[PDB]
Design an enzyme around this catalytic site. Structure first.
Site, PDB file in Angstrom:
ATOM      1  N   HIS E 201      23.328  10.262 -24.920  1.00  0.00           N
ATOM      2  CA  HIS E 201      24.332  11.272 -25.261  1.00  0.00           C
ATOM      3  C   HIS E 201      24.865  11.228 -26.692  1.00  0.00           C
ATOM      4  O   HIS E 201      25.427  12.214 -27.173  1.00  0.00           O
ATOM      5  CB  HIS E 201      25.498  11.193 -24.291  1.00  0.00           C
ATOM      6  CG  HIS E 201      25.129  11.569 -22.896  1.00  0.00           C
ATOM      7  ND1 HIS E 201      26.011  11.472 -21.842  1.00  0.00           N
ATOM      8  CD2 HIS E 201      23.975  12.050 -22.382  1.00  0.00           C
ATOM      9  CE1 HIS E 201      25.415  11.880 -20.736  1.00  0.00           C
ATOM     10  NE2 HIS E 201      24.179  12.236 -21.037  1.00  0.00           N
ATOM     11  N   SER E 205      19.412  15.233 -26.244  1.00  0.00           N
ATOM     12  CA  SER E 205      17.978  15.213 -25.973  1.00  0.00           C
ATOM     13  C   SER E 205      17.086  15.647 -27.144  1.00  0.00           C
ATOM     14  O   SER E 205      17.478  16.424 -28.019  1.00  0.00           O
ATOM     15  CB  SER E 205      17.655  16.095 -24.765  1.00  0.00           C
ATOM     16  OG  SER E 205      18.212  15.582 -23.573  1.00  0.00           O
ATOM     17  N   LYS E 227      16.703  23.669 -12.900  1.00  0.00           N
ATOM     18  CA  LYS E 227      15.371  23.201 -13.267  1.00  0.00           C
ATOM     19  C   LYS E 227      15.096  21.816 -12.677  1.00  0.00           C
ATOM     20  O   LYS E 227      14.002  21.553 -12.168  1.00  0.00           O
ATOM     21  CB  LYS E 227      15.217  23.154 -14.792  1.00  0.00           C
ATOM     22  CG  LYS E 227      13.786  22.885 -15.281  1.00  0.00           C
ATOM     23  CD  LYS E 227      13.720  22.856 -16.804  1.00  0.00           C
ATOM     24  CE  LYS E 227      12.323  22.526 -17.338  1.00  0.00           C
ATOM     25  NZ  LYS E 227      11.350  23.658 -17.253  1.00  0.00           N
ATOM     26  N   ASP E 228      16.086  20.929 -12.739  1.00  0.00           N
ATOM     27  CA  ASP E 228      15.927  19.576 -12.206  1.00  0.00           C
ATOM     28  C   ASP E 228      15.821  19.554 -10.680  1.00  0.00           C
ATOM     29  O   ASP E 228      15.049  18.783 -10.120  1.00  0.00           O
ATOM     30  CB  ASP E 228      17.086  18.681 -12.659  1.00  0.00           C
ATOM     31  CG  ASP E 228      16.969  18.260 -14.114  1.00  0.00           C
ATOM     32  OD1 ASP E 228      17.710  17.340 -14.524  1.00  0.00           O
ATOM     33  OD2 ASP E 228      16.141  18.843 -14.849  1.00  0.00           O
ATOM     34  N   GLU E 271       0.241  -4.081  -5.882  1.00  0.00           N
ATOM     35  CA  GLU E 271       0.326  -2.674  -5.537  1.00  0.00           C
ATOM     36  C   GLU E 271      -0.207  -1.926  -6.753  1.00  0.00           C
ATOM     37  O   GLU E 271      -0.270  -2.471  -7.863  1.00  0.00           O
ATOM     38  CB  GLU E 271       1.774  -2.275  -5.260  1.00  0.00           C
ATOM     39  CG  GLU E 271       2.286  -2.751  -3.929  1.00  0.00           C
ATOM     40  CD  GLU E 271       1.779  -1.897  -2.794  1.00  0.00           C
ATOM     41  OE1 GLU E 271       0.655  -1.366  -2.929  1.00  0.00           O
ATOM     42  OE2 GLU E 271       2.498  -1.764  -1.774  1.00  0.00           O
TER      43      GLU E 271
END
Ligand SMILES: CCCCCCCC/C=C\CCCCCCCC(=O)OC[C@H](COP(=O)(O)OCCN)OC(=O)CCCCCCC/C=C\CCCCCCCC
Ligand SMILES: CCCCCCCC/C=C\CCCCCCCC(=O)OC[C@H](COP(=O)(O)OCCN)OC(=O)CCCCCCC/C=C\CCCCCCCC
Ligand code: HEC
Ligand code: HEM
Ligand code: HEM
Ligand code: HEM
Ligand SMILES: CO/C=C(/C(=O)OC)c1ccccc1COc1nc2ccc(C)cc2nc1C(F)(F)F
Ligand SMILES: CCCCCCCCO[C@@H]1O[C@H](CO)[C@@H](O)[C@H](O)[C@H]1O
Ligand SMILES: CCCCCCCCO[C@@H]1O[C@H](CO)[C@@H](O)[C@H](O)[C@H]1O
Ligand SMILES: CCCCCCCCO[C@@H]1O[C@H](CO)[C@@H](O)[C@H](O)[C@H]1O
Lengths: 59, 67, 79, 241, 379, 49, 101, 55, 54
Positions: E201, E205, E227-228, E271
């Site tokens: 922040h 972004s 959107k998320d 894994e």
């Protein structure tokens, strides 16, 4: 004109919109479930206990 | 008496050009190996190719005739 | 508070319509898809190449490894 | 060694993503287990109550459980003691502990079958191919005494003598007890024992898919609808130029 | 303050990071993973608590308590499925999160990046200990093999190891301390995640073109909240599909067998998400050197910010870097694959190559090609 | 001057009902909103389930 | 050599920023030198640059590009910032060298 | 529901260990919120009068 | 510790009896809980007396 009627009665006031989402979910569940099980069982005719059950029930 | 649908289908399958060709390879190995004292070679690989082709074939058919 | 101190901007006009006046997914065939292809096209040759080069390596090594399990009949001739 | 034979892919009635287990085949597989495998193989995680509503009746299940003696205790004098079985009991163990198990199988240890199909690469295909795949060793291969030849078992020399042969038992539902039929049934049963949720799990997967489709759809519209304001937005540079 | 969303010491926070937060108008779907990673985390914690409530950290009860959970607990099998598979989803998401950042030069936000690395390590240690809990064969030997590598650190070798095990071999004392760590670490992750987002922040972004988005910022809500949420359902469908229709797709069957110290499994492998590292581990035969190579395979991430030579931030306009990048991605599928293959020719040499190429691409090629590209722009 | 400025043509994006520059866009308003709000209400119901 | 100069124009087209209408300089990462350089730009050059960037971002959000006709052409790309940036860096090096001295 | 059965038994014990391991972190969490609200105003003092003239 | 009715009581006893300084760590934890409350009650008291609750 349902979209119009629906918008005025259901989607207009946030209060009725939420009330609509509830009854909408109540009804949708009852329906989606039956339909889903109905599809699932039909796809598996005679394999489930539900089906072969009669063969061993009778005292 | 009852018959094992497996043995039936097992027979019918051994006919395959795939099996026959594989089966032949084995009998040849087995023969030269059985007729030689003191050696390594094992007809495992050949046995496997046959079993692999036969059993492959059996799979499609076998369950059709099982309850 | 980050809205208002961002940048010095001048002489730019923008026009937009309420979402209730326009189409959510418009021009699927005349615009959408064509661009989807445009985009796909421009990248394929940068992306695909190395992935394919890997598929090969993978496929080879997987087989070359199985080949080393089969026997060489040229070890049981001289006996 | 270093060579292994991989089992084929049989078309099990429960192989489909939406296809349940054939409960009639599972019921039979139980008998096979009860009357044949259970003499050497324990199945610690399954209880008689688990059969209820799946392959048996409540009455049937209670009976099956009373056919067994279970050790309870202590009592007043601090003594252990026998008692007839309850549906709350688990399938009986053949031996007290592995040491005793091996002793009765030539040093071999028959594993618990509760999670067998998931504990072996191949699953029911592997167990089925092994049960019905006993044969004579190829040329050059000698199996040490006590061991048996099976190409499907790693090393090919397994400590288990062919457990099943035609009519080694009979199904009370009247199904031709051929060897392959038997193996097929016990394998179906073994899948159930490893994952009783099988059916419910797929019934859910179905509902999950439909709702997933419906929701991903609606949310795609909504996202597009909101972004439409930006997607169609137009702009121009108008300097006083 | 007129609206109680700006003044309230708490609603001001929810607001200044999820509602009025200025976001670039053009961030693509590759910017959706941060939120997924978050949601994933809250999800793992919730399903984990639900399982921890029926688990018993003891070598004589671990395996069976989990079995009891799946067989007897209402929806226990489902909660168990979601947790183990959720760990996978978590990694799939985290790997794309990282890639995105490498491609679009997000690592230039150094503190946001360095905290990201720490999150990755913590997440790996977390899954490592969590894997031991069901106490199956792979759980025991995985634990045994990996923790045994530390004894290769001259001097304090056997020490740190027998200290960590709490004994002479992986046993009960090890199990109980692993349960505690697995229950703990996730909260540290949540903690650090807060720090991660704080540093972020500061700058705001980054975006696909790598140029100031100040001229076109938009309110996180409704744009990115919608959107998320969509990005969530999209991913969730396959996660659930694979989970509910092919539960044991990813898992090793050797773990359906109670751990046994007297029976080493034929093929000990992790894994999927650890495979690439496993491959690099064995690539170097020499206990210590293999450990160091493994260490650096991840710690290398702390170096990326310093090997940026390009005058442009992203790779959007750098075709040479792009292919080199995709070569790297493919280099990783290879290492992954190699990791799942036994230690035998051709695998051994293919492995050593892929490892070698991996460090080469990051330490040599990338910084070089960037320099070369600047000159091709006449800079 | 601002007088030389006009809003571009949004025909390529307009919904049908408001495509005609001479028809009251208010008549189809409750329609265009009722639809989009129906989609939303449905997503809610699905999510509630 | 007038060869690698063919390479340049090649790369320039490969890069593809001209498809957004961006000038080579519009794509520079804004480090400190660039930050300063921009502060020295004349109002007009600055606003022109601003619109170009806001335009590219809108394209990028839309997942579209400029019609082939509008793409910046290799020989018409104005290196408007390089002169200033070159200077900002000269000054800095001067100060740097002078402060060690 | 809380007991996980008909009386306090093992199922209750294991869920209590989990809660005991958990709650302390929530305490730490909320403690942060506690100090945040506090810092808005600053500490009070024994006389109950503005300490602004002497911080 | 071991969260099981058949091992809980003994796992704690094992901790005090076998774990290096396990007895000390156990003491500090149980008594720490007390200290915690003594402190919290005075914290509250203070607040009630000096009207911090405002
Ligand atoms: C018996 C069954 C009943 C149970 C359901 C009860 C729940 C009912 C609660 C009330 C419903 C909520 C109402 C919210 C009202 C707020 C509002 O304004 O609408 C929502 C508002 C939008 O507002 P407008 O479109 O502008 O409309 C304004 C109206 N003039 O915000 C939204 O978009 C919210 C809806 C989107 C949902 C997104 C959720 C996505 C989540 C993913 C799932 C896990 C693995 C599964 C395992 C398998 C078993
Ligand atoms: C590590 C362990 C490895 C395990 C495997 C991980 C999964 C590997 C699957 C490969 C991913 C397939 C995705 C294909 C995407 C195709 C695509 O769109 O590429 C082109 C496209 C073009 O975008 P622009 O240049 O900005 O142009 C804008 C104009 N419209 O590029 C992108 O989308 C950007 C790339 C971001 C995605 C990166 C994902 C790769 C993930 C791998 C992990 C790598 C990191 C290293 C981890 C070390 C520990
Ligand atoms: C005791 C005389 C047995 C009877 C009756 C059955 N099995 Fe068995 N089984 C037995 C032994 C001693 C072994 C050990 C093999 C070894 O050398 O380790 C086994 C093993 C199995 C296995 C597979 C073991 C593996 O893959 O490693 C399975 C899947 C198995 N047995 C199945 C099985 C079934 C279905 C039976 C009834 C139809 C059955 N066994 C009976 C001994 C005996
Ligand atoms: C617990 C795991 C993590 C969580 C919860 C997380 C969360 C976030 C969130 C929510 C964002 C903002 C949206 C986005 O860009 O996706 C973000 C951004 C970012 N994260 Fe992470 N992250 C995690 C791990 C990491 C890792 C491992 C790295 C890299 C080593 C990293 C690097 C970054 C960077 C550099 C950004 C800036 C994105 C941009 O370019 O704008 N994060 N992260
Ligand atoms: C960052 C989040 C987490 C990750 C990555 C994670 C991962 C894992 C992994 C890989 C396993 C093994 C799954 C298997 O194959 O069986 C596991 C098991 C387990 N985890 Fe977690 N976990 C997380 C958080 C938690 C939390 C917060 C708890 C406790 C509140 C928890 C409790 C458990 C329990 C009880 C098990 C054992 C039962 C089982 O194997 O399913 N986990 N976890
Ligand atoms: C986890 C337990 C708690 C912690 C960690 C904690 C911590 C703190 C700290 C560090 C302070 C500042 C210094 C001081 O005045 O002592 C503070 C102040 C305060 N706390 Fe707590 N506190 C706790 C519980 C509570 C409780 C139970 C109450 C009352 C129901 C409370 C009421 C207050 C108030 C009103 C202040 C203002 C003090 C003043 O300046 O007059 N706290 N607390
Ligand atoms: C308790 O062991 C758990 C393993 C696992 O797969 O966890 C999900 C596991 C199983 C078998 C073999 C190896 C592992 C763990 O492997 C690793 N586990 C790692 C855990 C943390 C970090 C920072 C690096 C790790 N690297 C590795 C590596 F694969 F490279 F060996
Ligand atoms: C799929 O069948 C399910 O089996 C469950 C048994 O565990 C029942 O509780 C569910 O109601 C039923 O739908
Ligand atoms: C993406 C979100 C998907 C949610 C899917 C919800 C479907 C789960 O539905 C479940 O199905 C079982 C089998 O019939 C029932 O026994 C459960 O009671 C029911 O809740
Ligand atoms: O971390 C973030 O740091 C920001 C900066 O303080 C806060 O405004 C946000 O609420 C917080 O979530």
């Amino acid at each position: 004109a349902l979209l119009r009627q629906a918008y005025s009665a259901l989607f207009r006031r946030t209060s009725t919109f939420a009330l609509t989402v509830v009854l909408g979910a109540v009804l949708f569940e009852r329906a989606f479930d039956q339909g889903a099980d109905a599809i699932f069982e039909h796809l598996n005719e005679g394999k489930l206990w539900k089906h072969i059950k009669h063969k061993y029930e009778a005292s | 008496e009852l018959v094992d649908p497996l043995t039936t289908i097992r027979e019918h399958c051994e006919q395959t050009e795939k099996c026959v060709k594989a089966r032949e390879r084995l009998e040849l190995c087995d023969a030269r190996v059985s007729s030689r004292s003191h050696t390594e070679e094992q007809c495992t690989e050949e046995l496997f190719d046959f079993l692999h082709a036969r059993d492959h074939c059996v799979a499609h058919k076998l369950f059709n005739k099982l309850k | 508070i980050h809205f208002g101190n961002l940048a010095r901007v001048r002489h730019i006009i923008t026009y937009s319509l309420s979402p209730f006046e326009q189409r959510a997914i418009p021009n699927i065939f005349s615009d959408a898809l064509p661009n989807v292809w445009r985009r796909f096209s421009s990248q394929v040759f940068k992306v695909a190449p190395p992935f394919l080069g890997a598929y090969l390596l993978y496929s080879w090594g997987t087989q070359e490894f199985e080949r080393l399990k089969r026997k060489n009949p040229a070890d049981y001739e001289n006996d | 060694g270093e060579l292994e034979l991989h089992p084929p892919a049989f078309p099990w009635s429960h192989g489909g993503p939406l296809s349940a287990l054939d409960h009639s085949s599972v019921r039979r597989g139980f008998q096979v287990y009860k009357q044949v495998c259970s003499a050497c193989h324990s199945m610690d995680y399954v209880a008689f109550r688990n059969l209820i509503g799946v392959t048996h009746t409540e009455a049937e299940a209670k009976a099956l459980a009373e056919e067994v003696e279970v050790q309870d205790g202590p009592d007043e004098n601090g003594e252990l003691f026998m008692r007839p079985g309850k549906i709350s009991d688990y399938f009986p163990k053949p031996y007290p502990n592995p040491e005793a198990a091996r002793a009765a199988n030539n040093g071999a240890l028959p594993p618990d079958l509760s999670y067998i199909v998931n504990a072996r690469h191949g699953g029911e295909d592997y167990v089925f191919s092994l049960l019905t795949g006993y044969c004579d060793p190829p040329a050059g291969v000698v199996v040490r005494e006590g061991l048996h030849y099976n190409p499907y078992f790693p090393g090919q020399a397994i400590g288990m003598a062919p457990p099943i042969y035609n009519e080694i038992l009979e199904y009370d539902d009247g199904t031709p007890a051929t060897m392959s039929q038997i193996a097929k049934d016990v394998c179906t049963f073994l899948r159930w024992a490893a994952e009783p949720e099988h059916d419910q799990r797929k019934r859910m997967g179905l509902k999950m898919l439909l709702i997933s489709a419906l929701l991903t759809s609606l949310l795609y519209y909504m996202k597009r609808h909101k972004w439409s304001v930006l997607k169609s937005r137009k702009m121009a540079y108008r300097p006083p130029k | 303050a007129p609206n109680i969303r700006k003044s309230h010491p708490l609603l001001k926070m929810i607001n200044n990071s999820l509602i009025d937060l200025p976001a670039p108008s053009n961030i693509s779907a590759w910017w959706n993973f941060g939120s997924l990673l978050a949601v994933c985390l809250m999800t793992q914690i919730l399903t984990g608590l639900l399982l921890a409530m029926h688990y018993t950290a003891d070598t004589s009860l671990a395996f069976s308590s989990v079995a009891h959970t799946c067989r007897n607990v209402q929806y226990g099998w489902l909660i168990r499925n979601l947790h183990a598979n959720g760990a996978s989803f978590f990694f799939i998401c985290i790997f794309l999160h990282i890639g995105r950042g490498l491609y679009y030069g997000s690592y230039l936000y150094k503190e946001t990046w360095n905290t990201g690395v720490i999150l990755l390590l913590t997440l790996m240690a977390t899954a490592f200990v969590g894997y031991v809990l069901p106490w199956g064969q792979m759980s025991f030997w995985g634990a045994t093999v990996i923790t045994n590598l530390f004894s290769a650190i001259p001097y304090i070798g056997h020490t740190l190891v027998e200290w960590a095990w709490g004994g002479f071999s992986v046993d009960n004392p090890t199990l109980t301390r692993f349960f505690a760590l697995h229950f703990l670490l996730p909260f540290a992750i949540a903690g650090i995640t807060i720090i991660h987002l704080t540093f972020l922040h500061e700058s705001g972004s980054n975006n696909p073109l790598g140029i100031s988005s100040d001229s076109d910022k938009i309110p996180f809500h409704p744009y990115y909240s919608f959107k998320d949420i969509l990005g969530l359902t999209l991913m969730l469908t396959p996660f659930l599909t694979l989970a509910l229709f092919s539960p044991n797709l990813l898992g090793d069957p050797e773990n359906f067998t109670p751990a046994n110290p007297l029976v080493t499994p034929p093929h000990i492998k992790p894994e999927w998400y650890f495979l690439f590292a496993y491959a690099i581990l064995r690539s170097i035969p020499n206990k210590l050197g293999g450990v160091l190579a493994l260490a650096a395979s991840v710690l290398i991430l702390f170096l990326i910010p310093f090997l940026h030579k390009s005058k442009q931030r992203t790779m959007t306009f750098r075709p040479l870097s792009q292919t080199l990048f995709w070569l790297l991605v493919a280099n990783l599928l290879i290492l992954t694959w190699i990791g799942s293959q036994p230690v035998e020719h051709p695998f051994i040499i293919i492995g050593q190559m892929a490892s070698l190429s991996y460090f080469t691409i990051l330490l040599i090629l990338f910084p070089t090609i960037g320099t070369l590209e600047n000159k091709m722009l006449n800079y | 001057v601002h007088n030389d400025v006009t809003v571009p043509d949004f025909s390529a994006y307009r919904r049908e009902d408001v495509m005609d520059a001479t028809t009251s866009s208010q008549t189809s308003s409750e329609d265009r909103k009722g639809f989009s709000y129906l989609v939303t209400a449905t997503a809610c119901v699905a999510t509630a389930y | 050599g007038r060869l690698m100069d063919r390479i340049r124009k090649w790369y320039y087209n490969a890069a593809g920023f001209n498809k957004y209408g961006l000038m080579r300089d519009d794509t520079l990462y804004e480090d400190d030198d660039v930050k300063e350089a921009l502060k020295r730009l004349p109002e007009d050059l600055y606003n022109e640059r601003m619109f170009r960037i806001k335009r590219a971002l809108d394209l990028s959000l839309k997942h579209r590009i400029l019609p082939k006709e509008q793409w910046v052409k290799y020989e018409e790309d104005k290196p408007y910032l390089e002169p200033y940036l070159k200077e900002v860096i000269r000054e800095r090096l001067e100060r740097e060298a002078w402060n060690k001295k």
